[PDB]
């Protein structure tokens, strides 16, 4: 790794600097270096890792969607043939996105998940595993598409099972997991009713547990509950 010669603590410090500078590719490379030191990550370090990669892949997904839209319009009837360029460039962005997903999935498999014994770390990493299989599923078309979809579902389901046993219903990781698994159901699995049921049940169970929280915990939980409500409003 090009980060092999840098101290773990310096990689973490530079990931925080890169975040402040909105240099998300650098932030992700610093956090990949920190993971590859082999030690478990703290709560804050897991957040740094997730923020870095979510921003990199989020930009790739946005560009992929622009290009896929142009490609679809170029393939309608009455459209003038523009040659292979739109497909080639959509494929280039798609292959880069798939590479970033495979990199994150590789960090999770070697060896973040297997060393994660506490619920807050294991649920976080299994949620990320579902997320990056979900991003692969967004662009998948081949023999492996169903297996990619099922890998996302399986990771999300394991995270859900642990979160329901080990975390309160307002825990922000449990809420964010449910938000994203609900989006998986709606957008990937063609299961809008399951998406809506999961979002509603998650919101209602969190609502009933807010009375137990401090003001700071309440702010974190209600932020995610508002996103569940936003999605429910989009879908109903």
């Amino acid at each position: 790794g090009a980060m092999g010669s840098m101290e773990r603590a310096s990689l973490i410090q530079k990931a925080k600097l890169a975040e402040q500078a909105e240099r998300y590719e650098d932030m992700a490379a610093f956090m990949k270096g920190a993971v590859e030191k082999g030690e478990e990550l703290s709560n804050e370090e897991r957040c740094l890792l997730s923020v870095a990669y979510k921003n990199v892949v989020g930009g790739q997904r946005a560009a992929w969607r622009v290009l896929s839209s142009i490609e679809q319009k170029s393939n309608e009837e009455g459209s003038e043939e523009k040659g292979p360029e739109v497909r080639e460039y959509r494929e280039k962005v798609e292959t880069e996105l798939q590479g970033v997903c495979d990199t994150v999935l590789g960090l999770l498999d070697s060896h973040l998940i297997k060393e994660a014994g506490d619920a807050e770390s294991r649920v976080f990493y299994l949620k990320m595993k579902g997320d990056y299989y979900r991003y692969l599923a967004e662009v998948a078309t081949g023999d492996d598409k169903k297996r990619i979809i099922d890998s996302a579902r399986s990771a999300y389901q394991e995270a859900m099972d642990i979160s329901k046993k080990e975390m309160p219903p307002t825990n922000p990781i449990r809420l964010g997991l449910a938000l994203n698994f609900s989006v998986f159901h709606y957008e990937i699995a063609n299961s809008p009713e399951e998406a809506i049921s999961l979002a509603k049940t998650t919101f209602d169970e969190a609502m009933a547990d807010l009375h137990t929280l401090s003001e700071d915990s309440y702010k974190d939980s209600t932020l995610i509950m508002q996103l569940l409500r936003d999605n429910l409003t989009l879908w109903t």
């Binding site: 938000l179 996103l227 999605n231």
Partner: peptide, 6 residues
């Protein structure tokens, strides 16, 4: 109209 994820 893309849905919210975190």
């Amino acid at each position: 109209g893309f849905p919210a994820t975190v």
